[PDB]
Symmetry: D2
Subunit: 468 residues, 4 copies
Amino acid sequence: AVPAPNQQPEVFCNQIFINNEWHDAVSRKTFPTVNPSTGEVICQVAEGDKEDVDKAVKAARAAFQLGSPWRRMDASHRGRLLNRLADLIERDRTYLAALETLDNGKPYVISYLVDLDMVLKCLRYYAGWADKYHGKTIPIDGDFFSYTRHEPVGVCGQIIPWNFPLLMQAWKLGPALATGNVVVMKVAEQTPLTALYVANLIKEAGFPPGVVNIVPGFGPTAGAAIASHEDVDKVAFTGSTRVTLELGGKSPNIIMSDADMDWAVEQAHFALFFNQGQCCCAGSRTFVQEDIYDEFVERSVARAKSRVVGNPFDSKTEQGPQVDETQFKKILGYINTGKQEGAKLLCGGGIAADRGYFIQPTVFGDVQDGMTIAKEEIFGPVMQILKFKTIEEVVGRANNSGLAAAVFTKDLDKANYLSQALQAGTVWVNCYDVFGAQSPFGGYLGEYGLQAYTKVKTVTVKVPQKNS
Amino acid sequence: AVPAPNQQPEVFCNQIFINNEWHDAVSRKTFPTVNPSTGEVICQVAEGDKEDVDKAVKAARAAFQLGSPWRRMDASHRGRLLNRLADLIERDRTYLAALETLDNGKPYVISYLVDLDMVLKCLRYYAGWADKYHGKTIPIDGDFFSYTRHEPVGVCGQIIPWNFPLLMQAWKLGPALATGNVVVMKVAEQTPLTALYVANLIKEAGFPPGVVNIVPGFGPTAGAAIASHEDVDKVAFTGSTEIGRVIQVARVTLELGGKSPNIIMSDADMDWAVEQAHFALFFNQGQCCCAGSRTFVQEDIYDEFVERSVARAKSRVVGNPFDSKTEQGPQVDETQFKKILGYINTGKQEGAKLLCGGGIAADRGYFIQPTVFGDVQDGMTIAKEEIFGPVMQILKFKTIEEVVGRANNSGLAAAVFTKDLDKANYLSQALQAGTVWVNCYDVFGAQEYGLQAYTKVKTVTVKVPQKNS
Amino acid sequence: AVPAPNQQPEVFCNQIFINNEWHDAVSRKTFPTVNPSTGEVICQVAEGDKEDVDKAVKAARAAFQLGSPWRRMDASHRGRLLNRLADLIERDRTYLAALETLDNGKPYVISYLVDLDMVLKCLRYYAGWADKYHGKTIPIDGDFFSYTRHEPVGVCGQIIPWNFPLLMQAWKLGPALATGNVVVMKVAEQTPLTALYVANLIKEAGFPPGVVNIVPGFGPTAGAAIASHEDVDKVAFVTLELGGKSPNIIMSDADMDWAVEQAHFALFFNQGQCCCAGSRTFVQEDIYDEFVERSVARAKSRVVGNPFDSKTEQGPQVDETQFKKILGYINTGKQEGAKLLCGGGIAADRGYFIQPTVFGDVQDGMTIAKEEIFGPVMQILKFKTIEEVVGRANNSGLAAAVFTKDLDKANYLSQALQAGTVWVNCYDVFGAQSPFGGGRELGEYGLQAYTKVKTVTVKVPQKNS
Amino acid sequence: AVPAPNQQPEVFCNQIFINNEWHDAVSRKTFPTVNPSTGEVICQVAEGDKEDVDKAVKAARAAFQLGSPWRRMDASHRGRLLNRLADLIERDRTYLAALETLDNGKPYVISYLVDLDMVLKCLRYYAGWADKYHGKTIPIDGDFFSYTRHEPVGVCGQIIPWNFPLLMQAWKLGPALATGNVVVMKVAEQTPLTALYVANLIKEAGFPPGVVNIVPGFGPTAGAAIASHEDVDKVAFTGKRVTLELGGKSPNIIMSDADMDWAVEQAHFALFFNQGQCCCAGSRTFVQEDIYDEFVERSVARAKSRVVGNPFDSKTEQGPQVDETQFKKILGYINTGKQEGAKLLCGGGIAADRGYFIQPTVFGDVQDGMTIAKEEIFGPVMQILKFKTIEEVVGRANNSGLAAAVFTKDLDKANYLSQALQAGTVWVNCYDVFGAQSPFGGRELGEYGLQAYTKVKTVTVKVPQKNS
Ligand code: NA
Ligand code: NA
Ligand code: NA
Ligand code: NA
């Protein structure tokens, strides 16, 4: 059961969020955010720049000073705050899911049942880690007592993409706040709305001023300012091609001949088409064993043709528009390159509507490794199907590219052989895009997400006489 | 490639080991240990009883006193001591492997390449854990610094069986010593020799006096004395349900084994499943806590499986353990010898189809022919009671849902042979056993849980000036 | 800031709780629960016996069956349920603190600010552990993939004492539920009410029927039935958590004012009814006289009276049996030669009130220095050296404390003291995250006792690092 | 008890070590390494450059290929090899200690009892970690079995300094090899000999060819080549994944209630150890005003009695500085101290006409703004500053973060300072106490050292009905 959406949700937040207050850009400039479904402007948004970032960083630094409310607060209480934030987001679940759809373009049913559900689960998961990340007491040689303490890194710069606005924000705030860091976040110009509203909930939840600061704006400006600021202790970027870069692209989905055909077909479809193909780990290279190639391809094309493209607020809609005009044209050019390179266009291939950034679900057959559409990730509804013969062969082709991969088979040995040989951060077996707030995700979440937001301090004390 | 064995190894240790010295029993009494291959006495061994145990526990307690060499020793050094012990055992590998065979009966080739090898790997694995089991610093509410220390439990009474004399000794000494505990060990009357020789190596390795004490003797005497001693902090028993009850009656842990299910699905690799099922049951003369004594086979492959299993059992070479061709030695002693025979009789009486073997394999020693019973039923005695002998039980089943219930209706171990991913995961999750093997059996590895049982957690919570994250 | 209490709270739950439903005993018998402050009956409570426990164990077993809602539920959801139960308890905080005081006797201010606060923290802490207790993937030799899974033990029998009725219930429920077990709980006959009301909240929270079952009654019957039941997987009273004679050591360099107030707290907290009461106060000779004098004055000013009065520091003892037992112990203290410094008798004609009592010049051989009476009776012993106090303190191991300004003395004592918990310059400082034991409770360690480890070892193609 | 050293150790290894073989530089160039005690050339050593580095990376990559002996080897066996290497170093301990002294200058007694002892303990410590670094099985939502594997990162570039040649080599090899990585190591031009001999022991121990490769040479060339190589997966510098391990100006705080005798001796050790060439040297000795005069008087007398001379002499406490460049830099800093107004209490000049010997130097009443109080010189130059309160000292000590120390008998003061000091390691009543088990950073050593040498792979499998 999904509640009826408000197809025209009101925008309450569209400025810079610093010290639990809303500010206009220092330059007073503002940029428009567009509804991808119509191509029309939703509203104006404050355009943050270097000077705005500097204000945010100063606020963050102040909120991180020894003796401050955030620093003195019990670890268990940071957990309480994250749980409270989660409760507030659930309260406004319907409103947030609709706003997400309005600004991003993804189907409202998905925004509500998937995006929001995962946001809630992420924050509540991290709330639980707040007071459970232990240091150690170490049995060092000599008459000493040695132990470690896991301290926060400090001011963390977070730049999040537009594909999953709310979930990306939660993935970043969850682990950072659980460990006691302060944040200066930059949201995507294409999808700044929902994150700004969450900022309002962060204040309502009771987080001290300056703990979380959000600076909407442009990449070359605000984004770069955060990455270059001398008082930022850590910067985590997630998007297109302490510092951590989280990029995604060309994930191989391997279908063995003994795989369940119906399941394989639906999963490979999902693996690529999910969220308009706008996923860092989209299974954009579907490797199919020769014995089942023809049948698999036939079923895949049939599924792609039946995929409903339309108004994201319509319950029947499976695919909304692409995020913006730039991606829209980028995907169209990519489809043309596929045709020019000799890939067999099986269906789709063009615009799906005269209004908005809609593209027909496209499928290319007989794709080769050397082709552009087999090497470049375009984050669009364009499926690439490649044929292969042996398991040894596919391993090499799949690895010749490492965020994620998948293998569909009923054979135990094949599953274990492939899961070990595939060089990817996450390897799915008979499923795809299965993330858990508790399962790590990286390239070549969970408790591992905490390591990156913590600094280790070792204290070694001379004692009278050590005894086991 | 295995060195030529001294079929008649000299015995250097046969007394009570306390404070790195050899002592005769207080009573001066001694018991004989027999070579199961000939039925002849190997030598006399000091018979420890309550008073001997009391001396051992006193020595152990003294070595565990605060400020003692063992207590003050760096954790990394406990690791060095364990590594030195392993080096010495390896130096005397050929000798020990032969002594093990002589006293226990297992094939020398196995004693050398399996038993010793695992003893070495176990001690070396644990040596590495000595300085790596950390306590925690805890983010408690308020202005407090709270942390935990994992201290040793103290005096640990360890009673080990006769099936894997040396390995059981390593499995107990490894985790206990790595964590800084002291030990009072009671070895099996049927196999006391190897453990006593290792005691000599423990002394040579440099372990302080009283850290490890070994009292050979009888179960209801020495064994019960350890379990009932008021100054023993922990007692771990590994063996038959029969003596376990006595110990339970006399921190306590009872490690028993029996009737482990080996499930063969229709899609299993036939050649592999047959050889593995054979190994699963027959390994170590069937004297294994997790012996696959219930081989469930899906109906569509039952006939073929049984045929191949019977052929394999008939070809199993029984004979002198010191002969390189020997696959199966004798049973550990006369009591088990007759107990197994009675069990085979019961199988016949109950309607089980005797497919091969079923009787004595030699006029000298405790050798029994590899026996296989077909069409076994859940209600039969040979399908409910574990006899630790070379007697295989093959049961037929139809569905996977069915076999789960039947396998669980008994939980040390279990195995599944199948090429199907979903079938492997379904069974590994559904089978209620401590260890579930998939397409393999008896695959143990020295490889943290064993450490928890050997440590005490102490929390220290200190008031401090204002706390900050 | 404590809301005014309802000094005579309504009782909504007084029956056996099985499968989210209220049941009368099969015998239909009931027993009275008394208000220790007046000696009068509060209400009748269903007297569960063996047959009632049997119904509870079966309901638990059913709830634990593979494929059941509690077994199939995502680990994260068990956490959501724990968090919802905490929210409900917080909603009914004022009411529950009053009921706890009515039935147990402790001051309402403490019930509210201490017991209820700790209950909330305990449940919320454990809610966080539900989906974070990982198994391991092990690098075994050979071409094998080996891993472990932490499964619930099953039906857990839990016997809760009367000293901290609500807190002990939370300490037992938190880890057990976070790990997916089912429970059959036996509450103390002296204090059954608060736990039964929490059962109602357990049902309201959404826990499946049979996950938590509560059987009020007596120890020799209901308690023994749980302990002997063949279908109960684990019983926690096998693990026995007992407490007694915890040493509180005051070094000559301690902060005098702080040590005096803390030693007073250490012993008198909860009418001295605490498993780790600092009932042996060891004081170094150079400060003994002054420490004793200040301790005596503090004991004399301790306000004893109606626990609902804001000024009350000490309520009555839990029941008449304890009341008499403590009085007999005070008499033995005088007979054996301990110096009675203050108190020593009954504090009121109604209720089980005892005057705060302090004994000086206590010797290790005395009965009052060896037997724990769980009462408002302080023992002050004198010592000379740090080496001496260690031996005396250890000659008894749930807890201990040291008061000193010296780093080395503090580290030497915290290591040498054979106690499960050692406090330095504080006392009774518990955290839902810090372990406690003489098995272990609280923290991550509390999860170990409620889990079975299953190893799965799979043969795989060709293993690579 | 230390054996008699060979004051003229023979050199057996002086080339590039690749695939368990000794190679001359492609250019055939060599550079002389000097004995800092005499200023004379010990021998010539192959001068590796980009081309030699490329060969080592290729050998390392090959040894890391799936299916190779190093990749297939049981984890426990990597541990056996590390223990064998340790046994071989122990066999050649007397020789190694003398060669360390000949090339670096530190007292032979220290090389034998300290450096070599720590090298042995470090390798033996990591040998034990080889098969104990577990992944996890995660309780994810839904009918899925999710687990992680900790895989090696791959080709690790390791650049080690000259202050502790052998120990630094072991700190890098231990964790890298225990977790199955392969190495391309660049040793310091000032001290390449001991590491090259160890490579010979690595071969003798049985490590597969290409697992460890060592390229002696210069920083701007060989080092830069490793850091910039496209096929190097991680680079660790001490002096792709990158980690810079730098050190400097660690504060040693002496409270008025400290044990005077122990504090004076430890402060002396804290600064003067290893000719002052230690990243965490206690180069800022803060002394509480009530004990200042006496502490200084004692420190001066202790510095004046410190024996400087031939490092092979058993009475020698201080050998020469590592090279001419450091010698001059220290003389420059001493002059800077005098010109700045710091009170020169003793030393301050050249201690011998041959070699690079400097007199133990003590500056008194140093103030925070002085250059000698802000820059690290890695020399036998002690700075003593005066302070009044604990709140004051915290701020002064922090205004600079690898290490710090506090000497006091008071529990609260020790906890206050160990909490407040922003340093990776805080020692209480001791200094320079390292354990192979305790982490060190500004991480290395302990369990923490393994995290940087491993990649986390998550495998998530769809399974029939899941149950707890
Ligand atoms: Na938009
Ligand atoms: Na024998
Ligand atoms: Na009552
Ligand atoms: Na040199």
